[PDB]
Amino acid sequence: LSTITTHHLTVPPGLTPEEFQELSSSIAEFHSYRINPGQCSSLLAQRIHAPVETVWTVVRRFDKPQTYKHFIKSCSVGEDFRMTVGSTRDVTVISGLPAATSTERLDILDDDRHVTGFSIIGGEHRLRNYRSVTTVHGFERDGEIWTVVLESYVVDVPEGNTEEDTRLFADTVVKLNLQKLASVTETLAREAG
Amino acid sequence: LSTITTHHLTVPPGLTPEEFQELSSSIAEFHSYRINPGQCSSLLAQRIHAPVETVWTVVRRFDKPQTYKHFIKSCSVGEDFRMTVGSTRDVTVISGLPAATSTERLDILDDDRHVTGFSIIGGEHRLRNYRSVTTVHGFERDGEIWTVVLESYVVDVPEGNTEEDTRLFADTVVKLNLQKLASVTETLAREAG
Ligand SMILES: O=C(O)/C=C/c1ccc(O)cc1
Ligand SMILES: O=C(O)/C=C/c1ccc(O)cc1
């Protein structure tokens, strides 16, 4: 029947064991899912050489996912958009197939603890019933500072797919976007203001 | 009816006008196509801070495209593979759909002038009748050296797609792979041997 994900019990790719020991409680709190047959879930991590609030300024921009995500043609949120849970955005995906809008809802926004998350509620692409959470975490060693971003998701495995058909694809895209986030925010850090 | 591509008459993205003036003849020679209704073609460029032969060692590895390309699960070339024109590779794509092999044929391999190219001859994905050429070029200024890689393609626009539905997708993937090529070969350069 249903199971609970175990992302909080092993070191995810891109994280060191030292860093995992610090984040184990956070992974249990925000990156645990109850999962059924026909779904898959994964946790991805990315180290960034920038301060936490620099990274968070980009991660929290629900109306501009294209700032750090690939394969987005445009993103629209209409007239009276405010950054509040329950809001939606219309993402036009670069798919190589006809025009496809992904309607996505903001599920979480915590500026104090640096957690956000969203749900794909409509759209004919390869990520049905997709739901994901992103959290941002600061680290220090001998005066040096860095950030770790954790991003997890749950998603449907389409009939005819193997779980790995879907997990490898979703992992590749999330990982590519985190690499872009790292590049964009490290550049922001190097240039300051 | 048919037309000739004009990649050699404008500065492609990622190239400076100075660099274009040097490559104009090469773009005409290796990156020109005759194109019909229902096809699209593009030219992409990527600057790399590494010597030409360092970049070429990776670009020419027809049996290991995953060294610099994303979304490749595996690549197989069988028992008696030799790096000669006419050889084929079986690429398993990360698509988020069921298992899909891309059979690809090596069309060009010129180690003196640093040109290669391949054709997708079979495979149920979004790049039907795909054909591409990659060329590598060295630059110098006041003792500093760099490389420019040019990569162009022609591909079918599926029925039901607009040309931009296909061109934006193909451009995004080629551009992402060139960014990976840059990272991989700049790392190789920094570490020498
Ligand atoms: O390629 C697909 O099937 C879906 C891609 C996708 C990319 C960005 C999104 O916000 C949603 C879906
Ligand atoms: O996503 C697709 O439809 C096709 C992808 C692709 C990626 C690498 C290849 O070598 C061929 C096709």
Which tokens is A32 given?
């645990």
Tell me which amino acid residue B107 is. D
Q: How far, in Å, CA of A5 to CA of A167, rounded?
A: 14
Identify whether the C-beta of residue A59 lies closer than 8 Å to the C-beta of residue A39: no
Give kind and range of the element (H or E) at residue A158: none
DSSP letter, residue A7: G
For residue B169 and ligand 2, the question of a CB distance below 6 A is answered with no
Q: How far, in Å, CA of A148 to CA of A15, rounded?
A: 8
CA distance B166 to chain A (A): 5
Identify whether the C-beta of residue A87 lies closer than 8 Å to the C-beta of residue A77: yes
Q: How far, in Å, CA of A16 to CA of A47, rounded?
A: 10
- Under an 8 A CB cutoff, do A94 and B161 touch? no
Say how far residue B110 (Cα) sits from the centre of its chain: 14
Identify whether the C-beta of residue B147 lies closer than 8 Å to the C-beta of residue B156: no
Which tokens is B92 given?
């398993």
This PDB structure is determined at a resolution in Å of: 1.6
User: How far is CA A118 from each of CA A94, A155, A159, rounded to the nearest angstrom?
Assistant: 19, 12, 24
Q: How far, in Å, CA of B120 to CA of B110, rounded?
A: 19
> How many Cα atoms occupy the beta-carbon half-sphere of A14 within 13 Å?
19
Identify whether the C-beta of residue A62 lies closer than 8 Å to the C-beta of residue A82: no
Q: What is the domain count for chain B?
A: 1
Q: Phi then psi for A94, rounded to 5 degrees?
A: -90, 105
Identify whether the C-beta of residue B35 lies closer than 8 Å to the C-beta of residue B42: no
- Under an 8 A CB cutoff, do A126 and B97 touch? yes
Q: Decide: helix, strand or coil at residue A32.
A: coil
Find the A106 Cα to ligand 1 centroid distance in Å.
Answer: 16
Q: How far, in Å, CA of A27 to CA of A25, rounded?
A: 5
Identify whether the C-beta of residue B50 lies closer than 8 Å to the C-beta of residue B189: yes
Identify whether the C-beta of residue A182 lies closer than 8 Å to the C-beta of residue A47: yes
Q: Which atom of ligand 2 lies closest to the CA of B126? A: 3
CB-nearest to B161 from A97, A126, A162 is A97
Dihedral angle, C-alpha A33, A76, A135, A48, nearest 10 °: 130
Tell me which amino acid residue B109 is. L
Identify whether the C-beta of residue B7 lies closer than 8 Å to the C-beta of residue B152: yes
Which tokens is A42 given?
């994964």
Tell me which amino acid residue A104 is. E
Identify whether the C-beta of residue A174 lies closer than 8 Å to the C-beta of residue A153: yes
Report yes or no: B96 at the A interface, CB cutoff 8 Å. yes
Q: How far, in Å, CA of B155 to CA of B166, rounded?
A: 8
Q: How far, in Å, CA of B135 to CA of B19, rounded?
A: 14
User: How far is CA A54 from each of CA A182, B105, B175, rounded to the nearest angstrom?
Assistant: 11, 46, 27
DSSP letter, residue A31: S
Q: How far, in Å, CA of A63 to CA of A52, rounded?
A: 20
Which tokens is A67 given?
């700032």
Chain A residues whose CB is inside 8 A of the B71 CB are 172
Which tokens is B169 given?
């997708």
Identify whether the C-beta of residue A168 lies closer than 8 Å to the C-beta of residue A175: no
Q: How far, in Å, CA of B68 to CA of B135, rounded?
A: 15
Neighbouring residues of A25: CB distance < 8 A, sequence distance ≥ 6: none
Identify whether the C-beta of residue B101 lies closer than 8 Å to the C-beta of residue B85: no
For residue B125 and ligand 2, the question of a CB distance below 6 A is answered with yes
Instruction: Print the SS3 string covering chain B.
Output: CCEECCHHHCCCCCCCHHHHHHHHHHHHHHCCCEECCCEEEEEEEEEECCCHHHHHHHHCCCCCHHHCCCCEEEEECCCCCCCCCCCEEEEEECCCCCCCEEEEEEEEEECCCCEEEEEEEECCCCCCCCEEEEEEEEEEECCEEEEEEEEEEEEECCCCCCHHHHHHHHHHHHHHHHHHHHHHHHHHHHHCC
For residue B155 and ligand 2, the question of a CB distance below 6 A is answered with no
Q: Decide: helix, strand or coil at residue A90.
A: strand
Tell me which amino acid residue A60 is. R
CA dihedral over B18, B19, B23, B24, signed as positive or negative: negative
The answer for A96, left when phi > 0, alpha when psi is -120 to 50, beta otherwise, is left
What range defines the domain where residue A14 resides?
A: 1-193
- What is the widest separation between alpha-carbon atoms in chain A? 53
Chain A residues whose CB is inside 8 A of the B165 CB are 95-99
The closest alpha carbon to A60, from A160, A136, A138, A161, belongs to: A136
Can you give the CATH number for the domain in which A116 is found? 3.30.530.20
CA angle B189, B190, B193 (to 5 degrees): 70
Q: How far, in Å, CA of B99 to CA of B12, rounded?
A: 34
For residue B75 and ligand 2, the question of a CB distance below 6 A is answered with no
Neighbouring residues of A115: CB distance < 8 A, sequence distance ≥ 6: A30, A108, A109, A133, A134, A135, A136
Find the B93 Cα to ligand 2 centroid distance in Å.
Answer: 5
Q: How far, in Å, CA of B183 to CA of A175, rounded?
A: 16
Block residue for tokens 């070191």: A11
The closest alpha carbon to B184, from B157, B141, B147, belongs to: B147
CB-nearest to B70 from A126, A160, A172 is A172
The answer for A143, left when phi > 0, alpha when psi is -120 to 50, beta otherwise, is left
- Under an 8 A CB cutoff, do B126 and A160 touch? no
Report yes or no: A98 at the B interface, CB cutoff 8 Å. yes
Tell me which amino acid residue A21 is. Q
Find the B71 Cα to ligand 2 centroid distance in Å.
Answer: 7
User: How far is CA B51 from each of CA A141, B145, B151, rounded to the nearest angstrom?
Assistant: 36, 7, 18
